[PDB]
Amino acid sequence: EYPTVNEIPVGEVRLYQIADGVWSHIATQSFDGAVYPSNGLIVRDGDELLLIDTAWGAKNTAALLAEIEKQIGLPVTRAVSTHFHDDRVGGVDVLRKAGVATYASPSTRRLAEAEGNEIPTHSLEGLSSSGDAVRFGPVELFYPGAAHSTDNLVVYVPSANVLYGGXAVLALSRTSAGNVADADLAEWPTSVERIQKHYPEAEVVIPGHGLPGGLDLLQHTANVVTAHKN
Ligand SMILES: O=C(N[C@@H](Cc1c[nH]c2ccccc12)C(=O)O)c1nc(Cl)c2ccccc2c1O
Ligand SMILES: [Zn+2]
Numbered sequence: 001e002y003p004t005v006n007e008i009p010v011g012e013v014r015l016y017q018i019a020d021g022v023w024s025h026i027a028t029q030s031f032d033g034a035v036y037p038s039n040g041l042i043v044r045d046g047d048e049l050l051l052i053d054t055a056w057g058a059k060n061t062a063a064l065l066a067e068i069e070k071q072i073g074l075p076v077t078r079a080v081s082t083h084f085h086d087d088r089v090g091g092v093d094v095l096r097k098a099g100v101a102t103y104a105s106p107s108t109r110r111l112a113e114a115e116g117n118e119i120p121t122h123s124l125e126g127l128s129s130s131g132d133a134v135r136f137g138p139v140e141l142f143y144p145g146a147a148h149s150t151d152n153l154v155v156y157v158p159s160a161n162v163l164y165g166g167x168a169v170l171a172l173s174r175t176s177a178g179n180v181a182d183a184d185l186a187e188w189p190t191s192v193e194r195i196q197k198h199y200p201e202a203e204v205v206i207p208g209h210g211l212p213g214g215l216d217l218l219q220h221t222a223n224v225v226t227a228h229k230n
Pocket of ligand 1: 031036037038085086087167177178179180181182209210
């Protein structure tokens with residue numbers, strides 16, 4: 001029942017309940033000659049919502065807000081982008097116009113601006129060093145170190161033991177490290193180890209792309225990324 005690229009059209013967004021108060025948002029986009037699905041996270045905090053990552057571009061992200069207001073009906077008050085690539089900050093302008101307060105680490109904001117990407121308004125402090133963690137709303141934000149990108153963040157929802165890895169974490173179907181132009185292949189396995197050590201009670205793990213799983217996703221990512229390096 002988890003949506004796939006064939007089941008979502010580009011421009012459409014689907015939401016998928018993972019737990020009480022926790023959803024993923026799945027979108028599709030054309031990129032690098034392909035059509036790819038992409039995952040994000042929605043987390044209820046009272047009668048409010050925290051958005052984790054855009055839906056990949058203005059158009060998708062507006063549909064995301066419109067799907068949310070239809071299917072959930074609570075306002076998105078804040079959004080965090082987990083790294084600087086356009087698939088995660090694209091739509092930040094739409095969120096801002098909708099009234100959403102957009103956040104990212106200072107390094108993400110720097111890298112986004114230098115890339116010509118949209119820039120979240122607010123800076124997240126206390127995430128500058130590998131292994132740093134801060135509470136942000138009802139989730140924890142963790143910088144495991146460089147992986148898919150130097151700046152990528154992962155997000156833990158302790159109330160539901162749900163771990164959102166973004167593109168630092170690979171679905172089980174994945175056999176390659178993906179688009180590694182911006183990745184630190186040398187550091188990524190160590191970064192996945194910091195995730196694994198910090199979240200041993202994670203019950204559901206959501207990769208940046210594809211199907212959810214359990215803690216098996218982390219070791220899979222580590223396997224793939226190590227084999228790539230060697
Ligand atoms: O989607 C990305 N990468 C994926 C690709 C992938 C492999 N296999 C897949 C299977 C399904 C969906 C996506 C995949 C991955 O690296 O794993 C992606 N990567 C980079 Cl650097 C980007 C840079 C700038 C702007 C957008 C980007 C982006 O969307
Ligand atoms: Zn990326």
